[PDB]
Ligand binder design. Structure first.
Ligand SMILES: [Mg+2]
Ligand SMILES: [Mg+2]
Ligand SMILES: [Mg+2]
Ligand SMILES: [Mg+2]
Ligand SMILES: [Mg+2]
Ligand SMILES: [Mg+2]
Ligand SMILES: [Mg+2]
Ligand SMILES: [Mg+2]
Ligand SMILES: [Mg+2]
Ligand SMILES: [Mg+2]
Ligand SMILES: [Mg+2]
Ligand SMILES: [Mg+2]
Ligand SMILES: [Mg+2]
Ligand SMILES: [Mg+2]
Ligand SMILES: [Mg+2]
Ligand SMILES: [Mg+2]
Ligand SMILES: [Mg+2]
Ligand SMILES: [Mg+2]
Ligand SMILES: [Mg+2]
Ligand SMILES: [Mg+2]
Ligand SMILES: [Mg+2]
Ligand SMILES: [Mg+2]
Ligand SMILES: [Mg+2]
Ligand SMILES: [Mg+2]
Ligand SMILES: [Mg+2]
Ligand SMILES: [Mg+2]
Ligand SMILES: [Mg+2]
Ligand SMILES: [Mg+2]
Ligand SMILES: [Mg+2]
Ligand SMILES: [Mg+2]
Ligand SMILES: [Mg+2]
Ligand SMILES: [Mg+2]
Ligand SMILES: [Mg+2]
Ligand SMILES: [Mg+2]
Ligand SMILES: [Mg+2]
Ligand SMILES: [Mg+2]
Ligand SMILES: [Mg+2]
Ligand SMILES: [Mg+2]
Ligand SMILES: [Mg+2]
Ligand SMILES: [Mg+2]
Ligand SMILES: [Mg+2]
Ligand SMILES: [Mg+2]
Ligand SMILES: [Mg+2]
Ligand SMILES: [Mg+2]
Ligand SMILES: [Mg+2]
Ligand SMILES: [Mg+2]
Ligand SMILES: [Mg+2]
Ligand SMILES: [Mg+2]
Ligand SMILES: [Mg+2]
Ligand SMILES: [Mg+2]
Ligand SMILES: [Mg+2]
Ligand SMILES: [Mg+2]
Ligand SMILES: [Mg+2]
Ligand SMILES: [Mg+2]
Ligand SMILES: [Mg+2]
Ligand SMILES: [Mg+2]
Ligand SMILES: [Mg+2]
Ligand SMILES: [Mg+2]
Ligand SMILES: [Mg+2]
Ligand SMILES: [Mg+2]
Ligand SMILES: [Mg+2]
Ligand SMILES: [Mg+2]
Ligand SMILES: [Mg+2]
Ligand SMILES: [Mg+2]
Ligand SMILES: [Mg+2]
Ligand SMILES: [Mg+2]
Ligand SMILES: [Mg+2]
Ligand SMILES: [Mg+2]
Ligand SMILES: [Mg+2]
Ligand SMILES: [Mg+2]
Ligand SMILES: [Mg+2]
Ligand SMILES: [Mg+2]
Ligand SMILES: [Mg+2]
Ligand SMILES: [Mg+2]
Ligand SMILES: [Mg+2]
Ligand SMILES: [Mg+2]
Ligand SMILES: [Mg+2]
Ligand SMILES: [Mg+2]
Ligand SMILES: [Mg+2]
Ligand SMILES: [Mg+2]
Ligand SMILES: [Mg+2]
Ligand SMILES: [Mg+2]
Ligand SMILES: [Mg+2]
Ligand SMILES: [Mg+2]
Ligand SMILES: [Mg+2]
Ligand SMILES: [Mg+2]
Ligand SMILES: [Mg+2]
Ligand SMILES: [Mg+2]
Ligand SMILES: [Mg+2]
Ligand SMILES: [Mg+2]
Ligand SMILES: [Mg+2]
Ligand SMILES: [Mg+2]
Ligand SMILES: [Mg+2]
Ligand SMILES: [Mg+2]
Ligand SMILES: [Mg+2]
Ligand SMILES: [Mg+2]
Ligand SMILES: [Mg+2]
Ligand SMILES: [Mg+2]
Ligand SMILES: [Mg+2]
Ligand SMILES: [Mg+2]
Ligand SMILES: [Mg+2]
Ligand SMILES: [Mg+2]
Ligand SMILES: [Mg+2]
Ligand SMILES: [Mg+2]
Ligand SMILES: [Mg+2]
Ligand SMILES: [Mg+2]
Ligand SMILES: [Mg+2]
Ligand SMILES: [Mg+2]
Ligand SMILES: [Mg+2]
Ligand SMILES: [Mg+2]
Ligand SMILES: [Mg+2]
Ligand SMILES: [Mg+2]
Ligand SMILES: [Mg+2]
Ligand SMILES: [Mg+2]
Ligand SMILES: [Mg+2]
Ligand SMILES: [Mg+2]
Ligand SMILES: [Mg+2]
Ligand SMILES: [Mg+2]
Ligand SMILES: [Mg+2]
Ligand SMILES: [Mg+2]
Ligand SMILES: [Mg+2]
Ligand SMILES: [Mg+2]
Ligand SMILES: [Mg+2]
Ligand SMILES: [Mg+2]
Ligand SMILES: [Mg+2]
Ligand SMILES: [Mg+2]
Ligand SMILES: [Mg+2]
Ligand SMILES: [Mg+2]
Ligand SMILES: [Mg+2]
Ligand SMILES: [Mg+2]
Ligand SMILES: [Mg+2]
Ligand SMILES: [Mg+2]
Ligand SMILES: [Mg+2]
Ligand SMILES: [Mg+2]
Ligand SMILES: [Mg+2]
Ligand SMILES: [Mg+2]
Ligand SMILES: [Mg+2]
Ligand SMILES: [Mg+2]
Ligand SMILES: [Mg+2]
Ligand SMILES: [Mg+2]
Ligand SMILES: [Mg+2]
Ligand SMILES: [Mg+2]
Ligand SMILES: [Mg+2]
Ligand SMILES: [Mg+2]
Ligand SMILES: [Mg+2]
Ligand SMILES: [Mg+2]
Ligand SMILES: [Mg+2]
Ligand SMILES: [Mg+2]
Ligand SMILES: [Mg+2]
Ligand SMILES: [Mg+2]
Ligand SMILES: [Mg+2]
Ligand SMILES: [Mg+2]
Ligand SMILES: [Mg+2]
Ligand SMILES: [Mg+2]
Ligand SMILES: [Mg+2]
Ligand SMILES: [Mg+2]
Ligand SMILES: [Mg+2]
Ligand SMILES: [Mg+2]
Ligand SMILES: [Mg+2]
Ligand SMILES: [Mg+2]
Ligand SMILES: [Mg+2]
Ligand SMILES: [Mg+2]
Ligand SMILES: [Mg+2]
Ligand SMILES: [Mg+2]
Ligand SMILES: [Mg+2]
Ligand SMILES: [Mg+2]
Ligand SMILES: [Mg+2]
Ligand SMILES: [Mg+2]
Ligand SMILES: [Mg+2]
Ligand SMILES: [Mg+2]
Ligand SMILES: [Mg+2]
Ligand SMILES: [Mg+2]
Ligand SMILES: [Mg+2]
Ligand SMILES: [Mg+2]
Ligand SMILES: [Mg+2]
Ligand SMILES: [Mg+2]
Ligand SMILES: [Mg+2]
Ligand SMILES: [Mg+2]
Ligand SMILES: [Mg+2]
Ligand SMILES: [Mg+2]
Ligand SMILES: [Mg+2]
Ligand SMILES: [Mg+2]
Ligand SMILES: [Mg+2]
Ligand SMILES: [Mg+2]
Ligand SMILES: [Mg+2]
Ligand SMILES: [Mg+2]
Ligand SMILES: [Mg+2]
Ligand SMILES: [Mg+2]
Ligand SMILES: [Mg+2]
Ligand SMILES: [Mg+2]
Ligand SMILES: [Mg+2]
Ligand SMILES: [Mg+2]
Ligand SMILES: [Mg+2]
Ligand SMILES: [Mg+2]
Ligand SMILES: [Mg+2]
Ligand SMILES: [Mg+2]
Ligand SMILES: [Mg+2]
Ligand SMILES: [Mg+2]
Ligand SMILES: [Mg+2]
Ligand SMILES: [Mg+2]
Ligand SMILES: [Mg+2]
Ligand SMILES: [Mg+2]
Ligand SMILES: [Mg+2]
Ligand SMILES: [Mg+2]
Ligand SMILES: [Mg+2]
Ligand SMILES: [Mg+2]
Ligand SMILES: [Mg+2]
Ligand SMILES: [Mg+2]
Ligand SMILES: [Mg+2]
Ligand SMILES: [Mg+2]
Ligand SMILES: [Mg+2]
Ligand SMILES: [Mg+2]
Ligand SMILES: [Mg+2]
Ligand SMILES: [Mg+2]
Ligand SMILES: [Mg+2]
Ligand SMILES: [Mg+2]
Ligand SMILES: [Mg+2]
Ligand SMILES: [Mg+2]
Ligand SMILES: [Mg+2]
Ligand SMILES: [Mg+2]
Ligand SMILES: [Mg+2]
Ligand SMILES: [Mg+2]
Ligand SMILES: [Mg+2]
Ligand SMILES: [Mg+2]
Ligand SMILES: [Mg+2]
Ligand SMILES: [Mg+2]
Ligand SMILES: [Mg+2]
Ligand SMILES: [Mg+2]
Ligand SMILES: [Mg+2]
Ligand SMILES: [Mg+2]
Ligand SMILES: [Mg+2]
Ligand SMILES: [Mg+2]
Ligand SMILES: [Mg+2]
Ligand SMILES: [Mg+2]
Ligand SMILES: [Mg+2]
Ligand SMILES: [Mg+2]
Ligand SMILES: [Mg+2]
Ligand SMILES: [Zn+2]
Lengths: 53, 64
RNA sequence: UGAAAUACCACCCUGGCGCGGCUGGGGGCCUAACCCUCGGAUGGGGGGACAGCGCUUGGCGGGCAGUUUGACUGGGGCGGUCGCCUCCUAAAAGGUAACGGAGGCGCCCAAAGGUCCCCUCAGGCGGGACGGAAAUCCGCCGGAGAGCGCAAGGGUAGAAGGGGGCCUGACUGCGAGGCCUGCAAGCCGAGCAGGGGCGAAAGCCGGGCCUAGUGAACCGGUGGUCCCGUGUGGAAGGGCCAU
RNA sequence: ACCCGGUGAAAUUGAACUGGCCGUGAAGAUGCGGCCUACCCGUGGCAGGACGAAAAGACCCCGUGGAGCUUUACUGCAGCC
RNA sequence: GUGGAGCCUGGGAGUGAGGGCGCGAGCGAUAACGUCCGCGUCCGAGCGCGGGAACAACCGAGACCGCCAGCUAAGGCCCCC
RNA sequence: GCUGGGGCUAGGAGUGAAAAGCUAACCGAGCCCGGAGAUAGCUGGUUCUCCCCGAAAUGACUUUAGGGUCAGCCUCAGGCG
RNA sequence: GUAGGGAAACCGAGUCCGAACAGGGCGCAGCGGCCGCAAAGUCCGCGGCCGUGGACCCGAAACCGGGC
RNA sequence: UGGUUCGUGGAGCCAUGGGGGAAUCUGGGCGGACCACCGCCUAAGGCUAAGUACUCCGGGUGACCGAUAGCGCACCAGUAC
RNA sequence: GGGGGGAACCUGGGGAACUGAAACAUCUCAGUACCCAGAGGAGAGGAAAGAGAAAUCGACUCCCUGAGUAGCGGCGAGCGA
């Protein structure tokens, strides 16, 4: 992790709870990450969006 | 006079029914982002203190 | 006639001016609090609502006060060093020291990750416009001397290397059994369940060929949870999950 | 100073029946080994040794010891604004 | 393999300045009664005993007590002996 | 200039033609009593007898290095065999 | 002491994590012929050691208060 | 600011140095920020035995000392110095 | 009427430091030591603007307990209703 390589949270797009924490290079991947992850509250897979940490 | 209970131990630890000493696992207080789900999950549990350190701590818990 | 339409009186706007209420700054002056002084003192003179002093705000402040000012070390100082990875020293298990010999890390990758499918290097000889030692092309030889992001070692083409498609397992809830080990840590992990990815399938997938890329508590922030709530309902504030 | 008559201390002192050499030994031995030298006991003297006496090294280092001092070390206080 | 062997649980420690030697290395200079590890040993704690002239750790040997008894070890047998 | 008598100023304070000088024979902070049996991870000292067993000077971590905590190694009790 | 588990509400021979009736953590179970005997536990004596006190004894240089 | 277990904490209560400044039962304080409900209690005047503390003094008693002990002092001692 | 004295004991007004935190500043030692004012044979406190959940108790003081609980705490050492 550095200034360019940030830590970030993944928020379930449906119920809105952050379920995952990961990292990206916001110069290499300047867009908000969108990732299908398992959400344990919805208890199904859902698109997760990068949300500020 | 009478021994005083140590309150550092009292807030971190418990004497089990058979006299073991159980603490929360360490190392998920922060810096968790790059730690695998395996790391966070197994760190979310209690563990049994090794016998040398446990007997020391129970001596600090004279009235439990 | 426009969106609204006119004489007439309200209530209220806009912004401006005057008499004011009540204050906020400046300015001049007054005396009587307060201070200084005067043979004379229930007074006169000067200062004057300042100064002084009370509470409170921020600042300057070795004048004083309490202290702190690391360790290793062929004495101490000075210099060097302090965690982590690789090799050697290391006496063919493991481990093993010196201010012994040599290098690296404090990152990175949205693919450089999962899976399915295909592919195979470096190099040397010969041949081919611009074109060379080396760009691209063709043939022959060529087990790995190439490659695997970065040090070194191990490993490796019967791929961990190169290319493509679909993807997000860079899972959630756990976890038999181990490695290592003073503790605390650190490491590997089949298997079961949830909901998925790829594959016809057998299956694989809980990041990355591997070993560095890191930081126990305490205190606090943030999202969620809806567990506690100081007579009761809430609320304040905590707890738990995540970061 | 020395001798006689008078009075009469001191630090120090494990005990001592306390020699030389060459060695050995915690690395400089009267005390151990080998050899050598040596009858017993004093008095006046000299200071080489008893690592002689004195002072629990001031130098030096070590102690998460102290104290004086300094400053753009930290944090306070007085005083001043 | 029955040994002051081993294992489990608990009470009490002390030690965390080691040192010589042999061998295997690093450091040093194929120096040091040098230094730093490894395997071993002895002194430490066996400054008890014999030998090595004397001498913690080299050779011999693990001292319960007593004997004017015997056998040995290393080392010795010309005299001190 | 020196000196008698009579007075005043003191402990973070006095006084100092300045040496940290002097303040009742040792002043970089007087003396007395009190806090007080300050604290001393340091040095010293630690008292009858017999019997059994019997270490360590290592590893890890340490403002740690001549001190600690845990492990190793000793010992006692119960158990296993 | 007779109940534990859980941060807690709470449940209870279980409980916590979890969606789980899954898996796991921490928990739950005397001898002889009604008697004896033994025992959880607990009380008192004794002893080793630990905590708090100066805590085995002697020793600072210093710090502070009040006086001289 | 202090006091309390409460060290700024969600910080109430009790006390008050400063500023502002009420009401008289339809008044007021409290029940841990706050608000509502519910309940407790009557501030800004004073006094009040006993149970409690201590031991100069007197007495009684010791698995207390017995002249280096026990008070500093058994004695002409807070003396001699 | 007061003044001054009294071994401790008591209340009020002031109020340290060593030490402990294995350094140190918040914290601790401790509202202790000490100074001062006053009381008396005791002093203090005392008759709810209390407690705190008991649908309750019923001044104060003092002992046991509650309890090393609740909490407070560089959530450290420790402090402690
Ligand atoms: Mg604590
Ligand atoms: Mg943790
Ligand atoms: Mg942490
Ligand atoms: Mg957390
Ligand atoms: Mg947090
Ligand atoms: Mg990772
Ligand atoms: Mg993971
Ligand atoms: Mg994750
Ligand atoms: Mg979880
Ligand atoms: Mg209890
Ligand atoms: Mg209990
Ligand atoms: Mg004027
Ligand atoms: Mg005037
Ligand atoms: Mg005038
Ligand atoms: Mg004027
Ligand atoms: Mg003014
Ligand atoms: Mg103000
Ligand atoms: Mg100020
Ligand atoms: Mg300053
Ligand atoms: Mg200073
Ligand atoms: Mg101090
Ligand atoms: Mg420091
Ligand atoms: Mg330091
Ligand atoms: Mg040091
Ligand atoms: Mg040093
Ligand atoms: Mg050294
Ligand atoms: Mg050295
Ligand atoms: Mg040297
Ligand atoms: Mg040396
Ligand atoms: Mg040197
Ligand atoms: Mg240096
Ligand atoms: Mg390093
Ligand atoms: Mg090796
Ligand atoms: Mg090795
Ligand atoms: Mg090896
Ligand atoms: Mg080997
Ligand atoms: Mg091993
Ligand atoms: Mg070095
Ligand atoms: Mg480097
Ligand atoms: Mg791609
Ligand atoms: Mg790959
Ligand atoms: Mg080629
Ligand atoms: Mg060519
Ligand atoms: Mg060419
Ligand atoms: Mg050409
Ligand atoms: Mg290669
Ligand atoms: Mg490189
Ligand atoms: Mg692919
Ligand atoms: Mg698809
Ligand atoms: Mg395991
Ligand atoms: Mg382990
Ligand atoms: Mg690691
Ligand atoms: Mg890690
Ligand atoms: Mg599945
Ligand atoms: Mg599936
Ligand atoms: Mg599947
Ligand atoms: Mg399919
Ligand atoms: Mg798996
Ligand atoms: Mg890789
Ligand atoms: Mg990597
Ligand atoms: Mg802390
Ligand atoms: Mg917190
Ligand atoms: Mg919350
Ligand atoms: Mg409530
Ligand atoms: Mg609730
Ligand atoms: Mg309330
Ligand atoms: Mg309501
Ligand atoms: Mg409720
Ligand atoms: Mg609400
Ligand atoms: Mg809440
Ligand atoms: Mg829950
Ligand atoms: Mg978490
Ligand atoms: Mg004569
Ligand atoms: Mg004469
Ligand atoms: Mg003699
Ligand atoms: Mg003689
Ligand atoms: Mg010699
Ligand atoms: Mg000699
Ligand atoms: Mg001689
Ligand atoms: Mg002799
Ligand atoms: Mg001899
Ligand atoms: Mg001799
Ligand atoms: Mg001789
Ligand atoms: Mg002789
Ligand atoms: Mg001779
Ligand atoms: Mg003579
Ligand atoms: Mg002489
Ligand atoms: Mg002479
Ligand atoms: Mg001499
Ligand atoms: Mg001599
Ligand atoms: Mg001499
Ligand atoms: Mg001497
Ligand atoms: Mg002298
Ligand atoms: Mg001395
Ligand atoms: Mg000395
Ligand atoms: Mg010295
Ligand atoms: Mg001296
Ligand atoms: Mg010096
Ligand atoms: Mg030195
Ligand atoms: Mg020093
Ligand atoms: Mg230090
Ligand atoms: Mg130290
Ligand atoms: Mg110091
Ligand atoms: Mg100082
Ligand atoms: Mg001083
Ligand atoms: Mg001035
Ligand atoms: Mg046996
Ligand atoms: Mg044995
Ligand atoms: Mg044992
Ligand atoms: Mg014992
Ligand atoms: Mg014992
Ligand atoms: Mg030791
Ligand atoms: Mg020890
Ligand atoms: Mg040590
Ligand atoms: Mg050592
Ligand atoms: Mg040594
Ligand atoms: Mg050494
Ligand atoms: Mg050694
Ligand atoms: Mg040894
Ligand atoms: Mg050797
Ligand atoms: Mg040989
Ligand atoms: Mg050798
Ligand atoms: Mg050799
Ligand atoms: Mg070597
Ligand atoms: Mg040596
Ligand atoms: Mg040598
Ligand atoms: Mg050598
Ligand atoms: Mg050795
Ligand atoms: Mg020794
Ligand atoms: Mg021997
Ligand atoms: Mg032996
Ligand atoms: Mg010997
Ligand atoms: Mg001896
Ligand atoms: Mg011998
Ligand atoms: Mg001999
Ligand atoms: Mg001989
Ligand atoms: Mg010898
Ligand atoms: Mg020797
Ligand atoms: Mg011997
Ligand atoms: Mg024997
Ligand atoms: Mg014979
Ligand atoms: Mg022979
Ligand atoms: Mg011979
Ligand atoms: Mg003969
Ligand atoms: Mg004159
Ligand atoms: Mg005069
Ligand atoms: Mg005079
Ligand atoms: Mg005069
Ligand atoms: Mg004066
Ligand atoms: Mg003066
Ligand atoms: Mg004075
Ligand atoms: Mg002074
Ligand atoms: Mg003074
Ligand atoms: Mg000063
Ligand atoms: Mg003068
Ligand atoms: Mg005097
Ligand atoms: Mg003088
Ligand atoms: Mg001083
Ligand atoms: Mg001073
Ligand atoms: Mg003097
Ligand atoms: Mg006094
Ligand atoms: Mg004290
Ligand atoms: Mg003392
Ligand atoms: Mg000290
Ligand atoms: Mg033995
Ligand atoms: Mg060691
Ligand atoms: Mg450690
Ligand atoms: Mg360290
Ligand atoms: Mg170290
Ligand atoms: Mg030390
Ligand atoms: Mg130990
Ligand atoms: Mg053993
Ligand atoms: Mg043994
Ligand atoms: Mg046994
Ligand atoms: Mg519980
Ligand atoms: Mg279970
Ligand atoms: Mg019993
Ligand atoms: Mg113990
Ligand atoms: Mg003491
Ligand atoms: Mg004490
Ligand atoms: Mg004591
Ligand atoms: Mg003790
Ligand atoms: Mg002095
Ligand atoms: Mg001080
Ligand atoms: Mg000081
Ligand atoms: Mg001072
Ligand atoms: Mg004074
Ligand atoms: Mg207030
Ligand atoms: Mg307070
Ligand atoms: Mg407060
Ligand atoms: Mg708080
Ligand atoms: Mg409060
Ligand atoms: Mg209120
Ligand atoms: Mg006020
Ligand atoms: Mg108030
Ligand atoms: Mg009312
Ligand atoms: Mg009202
Ligand atoms: Mg009130
Ligand atoms: Mg109330
Ligand atoms: Mg009401
Ligand atoms: Mg009330
Ligand atoms: Mg009264
Ligand atoms: Mg009465
Ligand atoms: Mg009375
Ligand atoms: Mg009474
Ligand atoms: Mg009485
Ligand atoms: Mg009496
Ligand atoms: Mg008698
Ligand atoms: Mg007598
Ligand atoms: Mg006497
Ligand atoms: Mg007598
Ligand atoms: Mg008397
Ligand atoms: Mg007399
Ligand atoms: Mg008076
Ligand atoms: Mg009176
Ligand atoms: Mg008071
Ligand atoms: Mg007063
Ligand atoms: Mg006060
Ligand atoms: Mg007082
Ligand atoms: Mg003071
Ligand atoms: Mg202090
Ligand atoms: Mg102290
Ligand atoms: Mg302490
Ligand atoms: Mg203390
Ligand atoms: Mg300290
Ligand atoms: Mg300390
Ligand atoms: Mg200090
Ligand atoms: Mg302090
Ligand atoms: Mg205090
Ligand atoms: Mg007193
Ligand atoms: Mg009086
Ligand atoms: Mg009475
Ligand atoms: Mg009264
Ligand atoms: Mg009344
Ligand atoms: Mg209780
Ligand atoms: Mg206190
Ligand atoms: Mg109480
Ligand atoms: Zn969701």
């Amino acid at each position: 992790a550095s200034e360019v390589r940030i830590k970030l949270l993944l928020e379930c797009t449906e119920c809105k709870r952050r379920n995952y924490a990961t990292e990206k290079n916001k110069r290499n991947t300047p867009n908000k990450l969108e990732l299908r992850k398992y959400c344990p509250w919805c208890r199904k897979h859902t698109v997760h969006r990068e949300v500020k940490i | 006079p009478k021994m005083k209970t140590h309150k550092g131990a009292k807030k971190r630890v418990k004497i089990t029914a058979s006299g073991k000493v159980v603490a929360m696992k360490t190392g998920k207080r922060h810096l968790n982002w790059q730690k695998s789900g395996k790391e966070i999950r197994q760190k979310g549990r209690k563990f049994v203190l090794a016998k040398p350190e446990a007997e020391r701590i129970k001596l600090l818990l004279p009235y439990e």
